[PDB]
Amino acid sequence: IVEGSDAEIGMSPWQVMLFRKSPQELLCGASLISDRWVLTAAHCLLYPPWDKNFTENDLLVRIGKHSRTRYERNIEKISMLEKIYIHPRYNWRENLDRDIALMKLKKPVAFSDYIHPVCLPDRETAASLLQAGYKGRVTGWGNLKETKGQPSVLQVVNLPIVERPVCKDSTRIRITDNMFCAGYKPDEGKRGDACEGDSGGPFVMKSPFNNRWYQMGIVSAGAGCDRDGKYGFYTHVFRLKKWIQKVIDQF
């Protein structure tokens, strides 16, 4: 998260940290959508070029963690993974189309004031909130700049959704309908972007209909971080909800 600010305690109780067991190593962001299911970026678990092809017991996860160096008691939780599910049509060779993945906790987590699930959008909410100009929120423990290095506290930043024509023109990558970009334009006087390490992290919007937070996207890609005329790319969660469904009923 570049040009963002520290997160208030409990402002993102669905924040999940994807850890690598040996060696201990922070890999990506992730989100809690249930007491047993966690959402993240497919390239966080599978990306051959970077020697990434993790399995259930290679990784572990942490929930409700507030700082990155001190273990916080009966606040944070450490859960193992029972299974991993990557979208069968995830295109890691080309444009990261369908950069999404699901993880089932080996043992459900108890909700608390620091740990709760984020909502997944429905037809109405999706079409109602995913509109250029509207601002969403991205969170993460990733780099503060292009490599301070990384934060000791969860970072947050609100960014506006950008119109497809503009996103398409900003990158030489084949943009698909399964993704959207967000960020300020050089003429808006405001900065902020996700960055390396933030992948898997959620892009959430607050619904005025019921006062609840909905995860509209997943941090997926970008070129550099917070560079003028550039935008971060996020997996469009709703267009892939049928798949999330199949995977979950199937499990």
């Binding site: 402002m11 109780p13 959508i33 249930s34 007491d35 709760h116 019921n210 937070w213």
Partner: protein, 44 residues
């Protein structure tokens, strides 16, 4: 909220979703929340 998932497959919370205990639950707005709200009010 209304449901998509089946509790036995999915777990709990498709229904305790999206409501922060330290914010919405206590009727407290977070420090930057309003920015999102205000973005829903077009270019007023």
């Amino acid at each position: 909220y209304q449901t998509f998932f089946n509790p036995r497959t999915f777990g709990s919370g498709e229904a305790d979703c999206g409501l922060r205990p330290l914010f919405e639950k206590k009727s407290l707005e977070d420090k930057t929340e309003r920015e999102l709200l205000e973005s829903y009010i077009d270019g007023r």
